């Protein structure tokens, strides 16, 4: 199935040329079977992008081109556009498993916006949640670009990993990213320590917020 190998990520600024490799073996690409490409815009279905190694269906931009060679195939986008930000899969046929084989998938990012530093807001558990014998710390990370953050939590500046749940970043209605982290605690754990901290690292910068049971 997912037996053709692609890089996980490819990046470029608008106007740049990028390529995506599709690496297979002798039982597919390989055994001279055609390679096709699909484009998956976020939230949508895959659409055919290239078929028969190099052909464009009607209404796929000139930018896109495909080639195959020996055991590999390649997709080129010559002049990245914002709207090219999507997932790309190669596909072909494998005679050793007698069926469709897909690529692992490549996410291309179009760096078409300047770096945006994150806004971080930390909420302590509400007393209402405490009355319910639960306690949840809420760390909201907003308006950052590009879309990679790491979150670490501390109790009295000492790390915790258990109780942590974090969403992968996703775009807002202004094309910057947001993300959220949650630290689950018992009301007793909560009332023990002197403070809790949410620490957010983005492009070499750190923002730390703190809340205390007092």
């Amino acid at each position: 199935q997912s037996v053709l190998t692609q890089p996980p990520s490819v990046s470029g600024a608008p106007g740049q040329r990028v390529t995506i490799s599709c690496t297979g073996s002798s039982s597919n690409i390989g055994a001279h079977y055609d390679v096709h490409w699909y484009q998956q815009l976020p939230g949508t279905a895959p659409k055919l992008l290239i078929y028969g190694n190099s052909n464009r269906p009607s209404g796929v931009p000139d930018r896109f081109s495909g080639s195959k060679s020996g055991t590999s195939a390649s997709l080129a986008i010559t002049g990245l556009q914002a709207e090219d930000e999507a997932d790309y899969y190669c596909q072909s046929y494998d005679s050793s498993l007698s069926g469709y084989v897909f690529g692992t998938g490549t996410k291309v990012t179009v760096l078409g916006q300047p770096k945006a530093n994150p806004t971080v807001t930390l909420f302590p558990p509400s007393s209402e949640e405490l009355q319910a014998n639960k306690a949840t710390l809420v760390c909201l990370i907003s308006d950052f670009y590009p879309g990679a953050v790491t979150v670490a939590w501390k109790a009295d500046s000492s790390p915790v990993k258990a109780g942590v749940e974090t969403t992968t970043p996703s775009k807002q209605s202004n094309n910057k990213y947001a993300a959220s982290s949650y630290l689950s605690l018992t009301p007793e754990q909560w009332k023990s320590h002197r403070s809790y901290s949410c620490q957010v690292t983005h492009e070499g910068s750190t923002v730390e917020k703190t809340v205390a049971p007092t």
Partner: protein, 222 residues
């Protein structure tokens, strides 16, 4: 050349079955080769099997023995896939896709919009809703953030609006975390003017259709 329309999202327990439909409009559906391809959350693409309606022949994929049953109703021009003995790993978006007419393994030139299928031992549960109250801790200059915490619900989705839809500017509703308990949570924040804190009323309106519950929670300062 073809419009493929799939049936609605589905929520199922382990061990039950699910039938998905794909309705064609245009072209000549009864001449095409029809595949089902699934995509797990954050994962790649996986072929379930194909049907060739010309011969009435179905080729399921090796990984799904007895579980997958594919089907065309030649009168209403509708393809079906039934996957049985569901497990949680069967959670995915399922696509109907056409290859061209033929017995070869052609590319997929046309694709339905996808059907979300969620397999979980969890049972339907509306959320608990807790205020994320504004205070100096959430204030920076002209703006203050406040929010609602939408806790432990199943299944997706949940919608949050503020003041019944009256307030849309400054609002982000985050995607959900899935917890080990099988239950979802998300937050909704609204960034408002700092001066409006304490004289403007803010109410988050959570709607969970799968459990038929709506919650209105007013969110107040300190």
């Amino acid at each position: 050349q073809v419009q493929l329309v799939q049936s609605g999202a589905e929520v199922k327990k382990p061990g039950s079955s699910v039938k998905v439909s794909c309705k064609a409009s245009g072209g000549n559906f009864n001449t095409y080769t029809i595949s089902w391809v699934r995509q797990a959350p954050g994962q790649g693409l996986e072929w379930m099997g194909r049907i060739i309606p010309i011969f009435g022949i179905v080729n399921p994929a090796q990984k799904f023995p007895g579980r997958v049953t594919i089907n065309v109703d030649k009168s209403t021009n509708t393809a079906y896939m039934e996957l049985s003995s569901l497990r949680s790993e069967d959670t995915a978006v399922y696509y109907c896709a056409t290859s061209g007419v033929g017995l070869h393994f052609g590319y997929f030139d046309y694709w339905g919009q996808g059907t979300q299928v969620t397999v979980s031992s969890a049972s339907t549960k509306g959320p608990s809703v807790f205020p994320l109250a504004p205070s100096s801790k959430s204030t920076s200059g002209g703006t203050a953030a406040l929010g609602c915490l939408v806790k432990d619900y199943f299944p997706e989705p949940v919608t949050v609006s503020w003041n019944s839809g009256a307030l849309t500017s400054g609002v982000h509703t985050f995607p959900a975390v899935l917890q080990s308990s099988g239950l979802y949570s998300l937050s909704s924040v609204v960034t408002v003017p700092s001066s409006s804190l304490g004289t403007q009323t803010y109410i988050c309106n959570v709607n969970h259709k799968p459990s038929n519950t709506k919650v209105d929670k007013k969110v107040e300062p300190k």
